[PDB]
Amino acid sequence: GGRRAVPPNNSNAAEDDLPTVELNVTSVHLFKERWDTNKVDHHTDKYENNKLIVRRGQSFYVQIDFSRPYDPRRDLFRVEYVIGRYPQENKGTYIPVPIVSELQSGKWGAKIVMREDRSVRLSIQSSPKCIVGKFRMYVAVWTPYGVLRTSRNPETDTYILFNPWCEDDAVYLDNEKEREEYVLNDIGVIFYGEVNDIKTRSWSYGQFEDGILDTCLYVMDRAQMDLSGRGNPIKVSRVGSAMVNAKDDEGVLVGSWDNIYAYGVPPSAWTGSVDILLEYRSSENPVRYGQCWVFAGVFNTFLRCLGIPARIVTNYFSAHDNDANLQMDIFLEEDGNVNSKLTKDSVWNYHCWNEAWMTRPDLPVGFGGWQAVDSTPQENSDGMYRCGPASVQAIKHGHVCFQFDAPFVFAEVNSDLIYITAKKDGTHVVENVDATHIGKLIVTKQIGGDGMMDITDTYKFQEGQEEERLALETALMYGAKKPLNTEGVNVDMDFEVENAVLGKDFKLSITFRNNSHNRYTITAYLSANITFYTGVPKAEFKKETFDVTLEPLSFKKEAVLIQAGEYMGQLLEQASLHFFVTARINETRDVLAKQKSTVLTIPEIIIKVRGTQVVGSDMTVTVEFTNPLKETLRNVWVHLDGPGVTRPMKKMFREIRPNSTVQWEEVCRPWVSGHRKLIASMSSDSLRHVYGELDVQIQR
Amino acid sequence: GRRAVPPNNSNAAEDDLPTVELQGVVLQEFLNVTSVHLFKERWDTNKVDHHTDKYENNKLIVRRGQSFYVQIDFSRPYDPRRDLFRVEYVIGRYPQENKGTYIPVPIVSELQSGKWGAKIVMREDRSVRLSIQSSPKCIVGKFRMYVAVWTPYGVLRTSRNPETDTYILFNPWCEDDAVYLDNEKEREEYVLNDIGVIFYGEVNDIKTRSWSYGQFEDGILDTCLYVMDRAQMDLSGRGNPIKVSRVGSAMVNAKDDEGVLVGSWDNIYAYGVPPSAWTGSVDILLEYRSSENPVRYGQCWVFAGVFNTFLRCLGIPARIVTNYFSAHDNDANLQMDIFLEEDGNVNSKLTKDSVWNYHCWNEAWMTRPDLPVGFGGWQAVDSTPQENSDGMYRCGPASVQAIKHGHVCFQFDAPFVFAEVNSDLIYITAKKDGTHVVENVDATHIGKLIVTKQIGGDGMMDITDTYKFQEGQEEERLALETALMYGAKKPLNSNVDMDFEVENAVLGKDFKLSITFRNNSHNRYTITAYLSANITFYTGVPKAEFKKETFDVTLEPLSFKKEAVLIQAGEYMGQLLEQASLHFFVTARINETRDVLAKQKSTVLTIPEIIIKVRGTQVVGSDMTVTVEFTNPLKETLRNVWVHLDGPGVTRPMKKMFREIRPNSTVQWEEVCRPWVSGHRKLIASMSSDSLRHVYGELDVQIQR
Ligand SMILES: [Sr+2]
Ligand SMILES: [Sr+2]
């Protein structure tokens, strides 16, 4: 056909039927059953699936009943696995599994583990590099006139996932604790807020829930992904992440940061990946709407479900859309005030990306392990896409020369803020530089429980360390950018905001230390704005200039008060507030700068249960939320979730008068034993990004 | 909420800057420009010293990093003690200094290096004449010019004036430009030349044809800006060769309905022009700008054609390259599988992989700052997609030096272009029971010759040694190991030589295949050779096996034997495909040793060319009558014959149609051209019909002033 002899098979759903005729089998028994050896041994017993699911590079048992006794003399047969529509032994999409005296490592094969009166028990092993997907099983009998082969049989469809338990698999992770956490765990916690006030919230990955695995295969099919590569964790993450953010009626989620969300579910409402993945599957069109942590919850569900050890990572004060520039420009005016016309770039209060576990045989030795993949697009070499998989280890050392998109995730965590006064005659002069703001704290969920784990030391060295300065020296050599010459760049200023609840008042003190044996005349300015979590300004709710005289060896503190009415009028979804404080030392003309952010605390949702905490047993769940506003919250949606206990659900209240409390009781029949969890979220026409949860423990 | 200002990613979108911009509190006896002068005109210094005097454009065109002159007329003599002003260049809807989309350009005592600055070089009564210099890292695009006079209350600035818009192209003549070529011969060839030759055919009969890059033609420069626009390329990226080529190559192959061309190798070409008819890039590029939808149809040389025009037009040196025996769709593998039956025959069912007779790609020149030192220079970029990490996209820019050294750890997509050229042929026997046995590896077929057009004229320049070392030698071996550890995959692991040579025939003639054996040992061996001949596409994909032959031969100890075969025209005339190539597989079994020998070659049937004769005044501005002439070589009728004529700077692409043409008849076509360019020009003709296709012809003319 001009282009290629055979078309590409980039669909695991398209199937071809192998001919039945160019000894015979009567029944093929696999030991599926979620209690049986196979599933229990492959660690695929939690999957709500009624087919055999194994993990590559490992043996599993199967049994073939022949019409007559298998005789090693005049008999010859082999099990066949085939995927997609144009199988090719050449591409790994047609695997003849030959009978062997013993199984070698890294090769396919079947040992006749035992035979008894017309049946043969088999031990089948698979290559540790096997294509991940859902294969078809057949049994071929090689007669002197042609192969005789089984008919199409759905109940034998075997799923072959990645295998972090196998040391020959690139996805290998050598620690059962981590294995459980990064692969087996189907509940997760997402960190946000601001570096000073870390807020957490649970998300449901739900990889083992009914259907999720088949949709993970659907995304790939939708990406027209060559089957020959689904066995590559790299290209798998490379393609998988590009599918997450809907590039025009294409991907999974439709991103959006417009506090309206004109026609869908506000990003702040979702409780997990489940209903999201199932909605994409059923509608077959992008789901509206999503934002970083959402994209992150979903991509993580996709990975874990296939068996690639993944986890979500949150960076505080993220320099997004850096275009590999290591500098953020803050434009101060001649008298010292932040210039709003020019200052157009912002630091995100926080940003969430993923890390995947794998080896990097495409790079030198030492860069394998955790890989950074950011599904939130930004301009990189290809032009506005997801970034990664970039080796966190190389990032740490500044080796941004190795793929993929490493110079852009490096800048997310290493940028500097440059305070530059643009003279009114059209000139510039950089007054100061803040090397310590961006990438102040990078964090993730710990292995034990719902705690926090500081993984900052992994992306970067400690400041001042030559290794730190070296990584910069290196980064700068292969694509890092520091366009402004910061040449020549004794008062110590710093301020603090006390965190408050939504609707209440708070203080913001400014401290001024003067170590010199002399006095100064400072002129300060406080500028408070209302911002999106991305750090983008909506408005300046409070401006305030100060006039401070500093005696030598003086230390003066001033206290400003932010009254609730000064902000309650114009707040945004995540309750973010940004503070800028700059000063001029009239004598020497030095400009001091400092900026911080805070979020207002939102009261949680209450989840309470009564009944029988037993699988199969009806257990009633009670949900209740109190509208803590002096206004009536309209069109209130409360979301309920809890994998293994409840499928996701949601309810709506036309309105909730100021200060009244609602309640929602639904009865669930927990289908999983052990510690499970219940998760709630709130979203209305105004207040949203409200969450609640509960630690149930199902019995049986 | 995502970003404070939308993305500035359109050169055609514009912002209207205010004329007056004051602030605060308080005649305006400040200076008002009465007119601006940008000594453009093809004769003038700017267009000439910048190498843009060739662009058939009416606006000022200038190459980055180098100075140019302008003259501003004021309402009253410039006084260097009171008056303060400056020129401004801005681009896109959302200009930003932070990002080089707004450029102040101050008056300066003396121009520094790689920094915008204007020096006052002459002051006549009421007129300042500046010498303006740009930054070598300037964005490439069409900027708007404005003059701004600073008052202590604000700026007063000129109003929208479309006639003073300025293009700033890359500049291969500037030492500080990433894209710098150190000598005029190369710069002239790879940047100033708007004509090239494409090498096709097969190694043992290299065929050439003229292709018009036509970068300087009217509308091309702008179309080029539209491409980057259709790809939503961030303006701040448009000053980077790497991004321009990483992004621009991706626009060439219309995935869905985005890019420039819809690729097709079906031999039918349902509702479009056959890739074999295109004479040059001008046609496509314009057609696409008017359609705003992908152009049908193209194949590897056409994408390389249209991409080359793109590259050179913006100012990046680039050349088309033609690799013979290409392993495209290699997925990093370093092996090609050919399957055999137990009796020695080729297993027509299992052998689904094919080697392209020839595959063209582009080489683009630029430094490489994202890579270590040493990998700058020519960079391979393949606009013809294939599975790479991202899967099914163009590949490149891959540093050609990194490839030659197996350093595939560097971006972009190096392993793929590496196996496009350095891969082996494995002959495997698929035993009747289901097993496979590796008979022999042919390691010298793929990547035989990589060739490009020469600097002087239309000859070829063997560049195979830039991609690889010599077969055998240590460096080639080490290179291979260096690759294998960083990506390249390589799964699998009796002295009676054989070989056959084909005597290439002309379309419609009988010809011969001459196979010759030889027995070195002192043994009387016995061979059973097989011969399979297939009609194929240039990619390697077969359509049919028109001739199957099998014969046993005995070999004397220390001997030689030449078996000749006569292939009659009739055995193939009935089912040829475009480009007329045929494929042969010669395999033999020496039953004593059960050793298997195998070989393959290809042949393209020579087709007679089109005749072009110039009659008249070969003088710029003066008419000249051009006569295209084609004779039906076949013994049957051709119908719906489309003839094409093109000549950059002599005539724009014109095409004529003939309802049919009887066998062995001749048709003439007379057009009167008015050459607007002098010197060595050329004329390209092409032919396409429902039957015959892939028929080209050219003529060299020298037009005097
Ligand atoms: Sr830092
Ligand atoms: Sr070779």
PDB file of C-alpha atoms in Angstrom, chain B residues 273-451:
ATOM      1  CA  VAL B 273      -1.988  16.851  -7.519  1.00  0.00           C
ATOM      2  CA  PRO B 274       0.407  13.944  -7.788  1.00  0.00           C
ATOM      3  CA  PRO B 275       3.589  14.560  -5.789  1.00  0.00           C
ATOM      4  CA  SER B 276       5.490  13.864  -9.055  1.00  0.00           C
ATOM      5  CA  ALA B 277       3.972  16.873 -10.801  1.00  0.00           C
ATOM      6  CA  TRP B 278       5.081  19.608  -8.457  1.00  0.00           C
ATOM      7  CA  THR B 279       7.908  21.584 -10.135  1.00  0.00           C
ATOM      8  CA  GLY B 280       8.799  23.765  -7.139  1.00  0.00           C
ATOM      9  CA  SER B 281       7.684  25.072  -3.722  1.00  0.00           C
ATOM     10  CA  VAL B 282       6.125  28.371  -4.875  1.00  0.00           C
ATOM     11  CA  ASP B 283       2.912  26.773  -6.148  1.00  0.00           C
ATOM     12  CA  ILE B 284       2.196  24.738  -2.992  1.00  0.00           C
ATOM     13  CA  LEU B 285       3.122  27.515  -0.564  1.00  0.00           C
ATOM     14  CA  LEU B 286       0.932  30.061  -2.197  1.00  0.00           C
ATOM     15  CA  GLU B 287      -1.932  27.631  -2.815  1.00  0.00           C
ATOM     16  CA  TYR B 288      -1.835  26.731   0.854  1.00  0.00           C
ATOM     17  CA  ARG B 289      -2.000  30.429   1.916  1.00  0.00           C
ATOM     18  CA  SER B 290      -5.105  30.935  -0.174  1.00  0.00           C
ATOM     19  CA  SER B 291      -6.705  27.653   0.752  1.00  0.00           C
ATOM     20  CA  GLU B 292      -5.639  27.837   4.396  1.00  0.00           C
ATOM     21  CA  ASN B 293      -5.996  24.062   4.336  1.00  0.00           C
ATOM     22  CA  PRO B 294      -3.403  21.334   3.545  1.00  0.00           C
ATOM     23  CA  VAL B 295      -2.295  20.861  -0.069  1.00  0.00           C
ATOM     24  CA  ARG B 296      -2.547  17.440  -1.719  1.00  0.00           C
ATOM     25  CA  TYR B 297      -0.312  15.573  -2.282  1.00  0.00           C
ATOM     26  CA  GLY B 298       3.299  15.169  -1.306  1.00  0.00           C
ATOM     27  CA  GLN B 299       5.918  12.512  -0.541  1.00  0.00           C
ATOM     28  CA  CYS B 300       9.413  12.717   0.971  1.00  0.00           C
ATOM     29  CA  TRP B 301      11.064  14.991  -1.627  1.00  0.00           C
ATOM     30  CA  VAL B 302       8.165  17.423  -1.798  1.00  0.00           C
ATOM     31  CA  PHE B 303       8.174  17.955   2.036  1.00  0.00           C
ATOM     32  CA  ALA B 304      11.942  18.367   1.768  1.00  0.00           C
ATOM     33  CA  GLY B 305      11.300  20.673  -1.120  1.00  0.00           C
ATOM     34  CA  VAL B 306       8.766  22.951   0.619  1.00  0.00           C
ATOM     35  CA  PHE B 307      10.713  22.833   3.899  1.00  0.00           C
ATOM     36  CA  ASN B 308      13.956  23.959   2.225  1.00  0.00           C
ATOM     37  CA  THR B 309      12.256  27.015   0.714  1.00  0.00           C
ATOM     38  CA  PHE B 310      10.944  27.788   4.213  1.00  0.00           C
ATOM     39  CA  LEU B 311      14.326  27.519   5.818  1.00  0.00           C
ATOM     40  CA  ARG B 312      16.278  29.575   3.247  1.00  0.00           C
ATOM     41  CA  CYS B 313      13.567  32.217   2.918  1.00  0.00           C
ATOM     42  CA  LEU B 314      13.798  33.138   6.627  1.00  0.00           C
ATOM     43  CA  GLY B 315      17.566  32.975   6.293  1.00  0.00           C
ATOM     44  CA  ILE B 316      18.729  29.592   7.730  1.00  0.00           C
ATOM     45  CA  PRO B 317      21.184  27.738   5.440  1.00  0.00           C
ATOM     46  CA  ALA B 318      19.668  24.432   4.454  1.00  0.00           C
ATOM     47  CA  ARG B 319      20.125  21.662   1.863  1.00  0.00           C
ATOM     48  CA  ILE B 320      18.191  18.538   0.811  1.00  0.00           C
ATOM     49  CA  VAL B 321      19.935  15.210   1.298  1.00  0.00           C
ATOM     50  CA  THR B 322      19.152  11.916  -0.363  1.00  0.00           C
ATOM     51  CA  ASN B 323      20.009   8.639   1.396  1.00  0.00           C
ATOM     52  CA  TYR B 324      19.999   5.528  -0.785  1.00  0.00           C
ATOM     53  CA  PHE B 325      18.542   2.373   0.726  1.00  0.00           C
ATOM     54  CA  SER B 326      16.717   3.902   3.657  1.00  0.00           C
ATOM     55  CA  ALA B 327      15.427   2.062   6.670  1.00  0.00           C
ATOM     56  CA  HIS B 328      12.521   4.356   7.511  1.00  0.00           C
ATOM     57  CA  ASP B 329       9.996   3.236  10.183  1.00  0.00           C
ATOM     58  CA  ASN B 330      12.964   1.612  11.981  1.00  0.00           C
ATOM     59  CA  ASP B 331      11.771   2.313  15.585  1.00  0.00           C
ATOM     60  CA  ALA B 332      15.439   2.478  16.711  1.00  0.00           C
ATOM     61  CA  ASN B 333      15.999  -1.114  15.601  1.00  0.00           C
ATOM     62  CA  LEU B 334      19.300  -1.809  13.855  1.00  0.00           C
ATOM     63  CA  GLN B 335      18.039  -4.836  11.959  1.00  0.00           C
ATOM     64  CA  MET B 336      15.738  -5.486   9.005  1.00  0.00           C
ATOM     65  CA  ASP B 337      14.005  -8.893   8.693  1.00  0.00           C
ATOM     66  CA  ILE B 338      13.698 -10.879   5.444  1.00  0.00           C
ATOM     67  CA  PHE B 339      12.004 -14.291   5.868  1.00  0.00           C
ATOM     68  CA  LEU B 340      12.751 -17.454   3.940  1.00  0.00           C
ATOM     69  CA  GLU B 341      11.010 -20.776   3.356  1.00  0.00           C
ATOM     70  CA  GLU B 342      12.975 -23.918   4.224  1.00  0.00           C
ATOM     71  CA  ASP B 343      13.625 -24.549   0.544  1.00  0.00           C
ATOM     72  CA  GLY B 344      15.411 -21.199   0.195  1.00  0.00           C
ATOM     73  CA  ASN B 345      12.578 -19.039  -1.189  1.00  0.00           C
ATOM     74  CA  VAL B 346      11.648 -15.613   0.173  1.00  0.00           C
ATOM     75  CA  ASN B 347       8.631 -15.902   2.474  1.00  0.00           C
ATOM     76  CA  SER B 348       6.381 -13.357   0.779  1.00  0.00           C
ATOM     77  CA  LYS B 349       4.012 -13.415   3.744  1.00  0.00           C
ATOM     78  CA  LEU B 350       6.295 -12.895   6.697  1.00  0.00           C
ATOM     79  CA  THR B 351       8.495 -10.309   5.036  1.00  0.00           C
ATOM     80  CA  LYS B 352       6.451  -7.189   5.687  1.00  0.00           C
ATOM     81  CA  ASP B 353       9.318  -4.720   6.200  1.00  0.00           C
ATOM     82  CA  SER B 354      10.753  -2.863   3.152  1.00  0.00           C
ATOM     83  CA  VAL B 355      13.822  -0.704   2.418  1.00  0.00           C
ATOM     84  CA  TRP B 356      13.136   2.593   0.666  1.00  0.00           C
ATOM     85  CA  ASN B 357      14.935   2.942  -2.639  1.00  0.00           C
ATOM     86  CA  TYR B 358      15.814   6.513  -1.589  1.00  0.00           C
ATOM     87  CA  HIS B 359      14.544   8.863   1.080  1.00  0.00           C
ATOM     88  CA  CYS B 360      15.302  12.593   1.133  1.00  0.00           C
ATOM     89  CA  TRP B 361      15.531  14.717   4.243  1.00  0.00           C
ATOM     90  CA  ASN B 362      16.889  18.205   4.976  1.00  0.00           C
ATOM     91  CA  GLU B 363      20.050  19.385   6.651  1.00  0.00           C
ATOM     92  CA  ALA B 364      19.797  22.753   8.337  1.00  0.00           C
ATOM     93  CA  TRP B 365      22.786  24.735   9.568  1.00  0.00           C
ATOM     94  CA  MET B 366      22.923  26.329  13.031  1.00  0.00           C
ATOM     95  CA  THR B 367      24.865  26.021  16.266  1.00  0.00           C
ATOM     96  CA  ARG B 368      23.692  23.764  19.082  1.00  0.00           C
ATOM     97  CA  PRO B 369      23.861  25.426  22.548  1.00  0.00           C
ATOM     98  CA  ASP B 370      21.535  22.920  24.170  1.00  0.00           C
ATOM     99  CA  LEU B 371      24.128  20.263  23.333  1.00  0.00           C
ATOM    100  CA  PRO B 372      27.727  19.978  24.234  1.00  0.00           C
ATOM    101  CA  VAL B 373      30.321  21.727  22.143  1.00  0.00           C
ATOM    102  CA  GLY B 374      31.090  19.899  18.894  1.00  0.00           C
ATOM    103  CA  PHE B 375      27.536  19.129  17.797  1.00  0.00           C
ATOM    104  CA  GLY B 376      26.846  22.363  15.936  1.00  0.00           C
ATOM    105  CA  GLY B 377      26.737  22.614  12.123  1.00  0.00           C
ATOM    106  CA  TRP B 378      24.447  20.585   9.890  1.00  0.00           C
ATOM    107  CA  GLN B 379      21.440  19.142  11.679  1.00  0.00           C
ATOM    108  CA  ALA B 380      19.277  16.403  10.125  1.00  0.00           C
ATOM    109  CA  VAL B 381      15.528  17.092  10.176  1.00  0.00           C
ATOM    110  CA  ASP B 382      13.126  14.607   8.585  1.00  0.00           C
ATOM    111  CA  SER B 383       9.725  16.109   7.798  1.00  0.00           C
ATOM    112  CA  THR B 384       8.440  12.637   6.807  1.00  0.00           C
ATOM    113  CA  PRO B 385       7.016  11.285  10.095  1.00  0.00           C
ATOM    114  CA  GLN B 386       7.788   7.979  11.767  1.00  0.00           C
ATOM    115  CA  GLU B 387       7.458   6.601  15.259  1.00  0.00           C
ATOM    116  CA  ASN B 388       9.852   8.246  17.618  1.00  0.00           C
ATOM    117  CA  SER B 389       9.462   8.833  21.404  1.00  0.00           C
ATOM    118  CA  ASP B 390       6.468  11.088  20.751  1.00  0.00           C
ATOM    119  CA  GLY B 391       5.375   8.724  18.001  1.00  0.00           C
ATOM    120  CA  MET B 392       4.569   9.555  14.402  1.00  0.00           C
ATOM    121  CA  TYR B 393       6.099  12.915  13.867  1.00  0.00           C
ATOM    122  CA  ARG B 394       9.001  14.359  12.014  1.00  0.00           C
ATOM    123  CA  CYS B 395      12.368  13.657  13.667  1.00  0.00           C
ATOM    124  CA  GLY B 396      15.125  16.209  14.256  1.00  0.00           C
ATOM    125  CA  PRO B 397      17.041  18.360  14.535  1.00  0.00           C
ATOM    126  CA  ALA B 398      19.498  15.536  15.238  1.00  0.00           C
ATOM    127  CA  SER B 399      23.147  16.709  15.239  1.00  0.00           C
ATOM    128  CA  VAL B 400      24.725  15.055  12.173  1.00  0.00           C
ATOM    129  CA  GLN B 401      28.018  14.802  14.082  1.00  0.00           C
ATOM    130  CA  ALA B 402      26.366  13.066  17.000  1.00  0.00           C
ATOM    131  CA  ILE B 403      24.919  10.495  14.566  1.00  0.00           C
ATOM    132  CA  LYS B 404      28.295   9.718  12.988  1.00  0.00           C
ATOM    133  CA  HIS B 405      29.480   9.017  16.480  1.00  0.00           C
ATOM    134  CA  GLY B 406      26.585   6.974  17.782  1.00  0.00           C
ATOM    135  CA  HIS B 407      25.918   9.626  20.454  1.00  0.00           C
ATOM    136  CA  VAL B 408      22.193   9.095  20.319  1.00  0.00           C
ATOM    137  CA  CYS B 409      21.671  10.284  23.925  1.00  0.00           C
ATOM    138  CA  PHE B 410      21.203  13.814  22.542  1.00  0.00           C
ATOM    139  CA  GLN B 411      17.984  15.356  21.177  1.00  0.00           C
ATOM    140  CA  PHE B 412      16.118  15.408  18.960  1.00  0.00           C
ATOM    141  CA  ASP B 413      15.207  11.837  17.880  1.00  0.00           C
ATOM    142  CA  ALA B 414      18.788  10.754  17.030  1.00  0.00           C
ATOM    143  CA  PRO B 415      18.283   6.961  17.253  1.00  0.00           C
ATOM    144  CA  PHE B 416      15.720   7.010  14.498  1.00  0.00           C
ATOM    145  CA  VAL B 417      17.736   8.866  11.831  1.00  0.00           C
ATOM    146  CA  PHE B 418      20.750   6.738  12.979  1.00  0.00           C
ATOM    147  CA  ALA B 419      19.009   3.496  12.038  1.00  0.00           C
ATOM    148  CA  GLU B 420      17.645   5.153   8.924  1.00  0.00           C
ATOM    149  CA  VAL B 421      21.159   4.935   7.679  1.00  0.00           C
ATOM    150  CA  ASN B 422      23.153   2.339   9.705  1.00  0.00           C
ATOM    151  CA  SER B 423      20.953  -0.778   9.866  1.00  0.00           C
ATOM    152  CA  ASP B 424      21.482  -4.437   8.828  1.00  0.00           C
ATOM    153  CA  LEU B 425      19.542  -6.986   6.809  1.00  0.00           C
ATOM    154  CA  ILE B 426      19.028 -10.321   8.603  1.00  0.00           C
ATOM    155  CA  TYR B 427      18.056 -13.339   6.549  1.00  0.00           C
ATOM    156  CA  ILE B 428      15.995 -15.648   8.683  1.00  0.00           C
ATOM    157  CA  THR B 429      14.495 -19.001   7.762  1.00  0.00           C
ATOM    158  CA  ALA B 430      11.115 -19.674   9.291  1.00  0.00           C
ATOM    159  CA  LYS B 431      10.996 -23.446   9.685  1.00  0.00           C
ATOM    160  CA  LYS B 432       7.783 -25.278   8.849  1.00  0.00           C
ATOM    161  CA  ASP B 433       7.192 -26.075  12.538  1.00  0.00           C
ATOM    162  CA  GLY B 434       7.207 -22.475  13.738  1.00  0.00           C
ATOM    163  CA  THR B 435      10.877 -21.772  14.558  1.00  0.00           C
ATOM    164  CA  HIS B 436      13.302 -19.315  12.973  1.00  0.00           C
ATOM    165  CA  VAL B 437      16.992 -19.675  12.050  1.00  0.00           C
ATOM    166  CA  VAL B 438      19.289 -16.749  11.064  1.00  0.00           C
ATOM    167  CA  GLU B 439      21.011 -17.572   7.756  1.00  0.00           C
ATOM    168  CA  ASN B 440      23.118 -14.473   7.132  1.00  0.00           C
ATOM    169  CA  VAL B 441      23.348 -10.761   7.748  1.00  0.00           C
ATOM    170  CA  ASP B 442      23.874  -8.251   4.938  1.00  0.00           C
ATOM    171  CA  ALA B 443      25.428  -5.220   6.583  1.00  0.00           C
ATOM    172  CA  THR B 444      26.311  -3.046   3.660  1.00  0.00           C
ATOM    173  CA  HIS B 445      22.994  -2.421   1.845  1.00  0.00           C
ATOM    174  CA  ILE B 446      21.214   0.262   3.866  1.00  0.00           C
ATOM    175  CA  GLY B 447      22.914   3.645   3.802  1.00  0.00           C
ATOM    176  CA  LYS B 448      24.950   2.914   0.673  1.00  0.00           C
ATOM    177  CA  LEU B 449      25.347   6.552  -0.453  1.00  0.00           C
ATOM    178  CA  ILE B 450      24.081   9.800   1.053  1.00  0.00           C
ATOM    179  CA  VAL B 451      24.395  12.563  -1.513  1.00  0.00           C
TER     180      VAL B 451
END
